[PDB]
Design a binder for this molecule. Structure first.
Ligand SMILES: CC(=O)SCCNC(=O)CCNC(=O)[C@H](O)C(C)(C)COP(=O)(O)OP(=O)(O)OC[C@H]1O[C@@H](n2cnc3c(N)ncnc32)[C@H](O)[C@@H]1OP(=O)(O)O
Length: 180
């Protein structure tokens, strides 16, 4: 499979999913900083990114988790730029289940980048038999995240009551799955 390269997974001509490396720390930090105000509306971590060392710490932990298959953290490269992150935030090996996460900088939204990334990951991990069940959990009111889940052919399984906390407030989640 020529799309599986040493630097990452080649989705298409424009998109590569990069394996984390410390060299990406600065660009990733600047991307987060540029998107901090908008990101806080949907995710819990951005309020806690204040300096480049927070980016370094994230990369260090991601590399540890990738090494030990606790997670699969990938940096989305669109053309020449890091666009965001797509991940298996949790890999449950015993149950062959992966829980998916994603985010994109504002300047990279509306381009099908995450949908293309997710389709590629499900091909590579699903059709190979490594993962049988893929899961997306997202807050009910998150319009774009719900749209992405459906765009990727996931099926709504239920509503998880008060399951995700942002700023001390618990919100309901939709849980979606794609089963191989
Ligand atoms: C599971 C979780 O992680 S929940 C948390 C999700 N993250 C966040 O909420 C963080 C803040 N938000 C974001 O980062 C983004 O809004 C995301 C990642 C949720 C969605 O970004 P999108 O760019 O909409 O992702 P996606 O890859 O599905 O692209 C679809 C959009 O691109 C357009 N598009 C353009 N080209 C294509 C293409 N080739 N293929 C598919 N769609 C395309 C679609 O029309 C659609 O645009 P629309 O929203 O105007 O209808």
């Amino acid at each position: 499979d020529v799309s599986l390269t040493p630097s990452g997974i080649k989705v298409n001509d424009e998109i590569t999913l990069l394996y984390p490396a410390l060299k990406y720390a600065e660009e990733l930090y600047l991307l987060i900083n540029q998107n901090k105000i908008n990101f806080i509306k949907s995710m819990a971590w951005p309020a806690f990114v204040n300096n480049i060392s927070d980016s370094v710490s994230f990369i260090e932990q991601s590399m540890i988790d990738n090494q030990n298959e606790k997670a699969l953290i990938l940096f989305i490269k669109y053309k020449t730029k890091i666009a965001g992150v797509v991940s298996f935030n949790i890999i449950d090996h015993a149950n062959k289940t992966a829980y998916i996460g994603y985010w994109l900088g504002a300047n990279f939204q509306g381009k099908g980048i995450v949908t293309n990334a997710i389709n590629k990951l499900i091909q590579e991990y699903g059709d190979s038999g490594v993962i049988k069940r893929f899961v997306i959990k997202c807050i009910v009111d998150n319009k774009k995240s719900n749209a992405t889940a459906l765009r990727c052919g996931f099926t709504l399984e239920g509503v998880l009551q008060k399951a995700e906390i942002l700023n001390g407030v618990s919100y309901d989640q939709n849980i979606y799955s794609k089963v191989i």
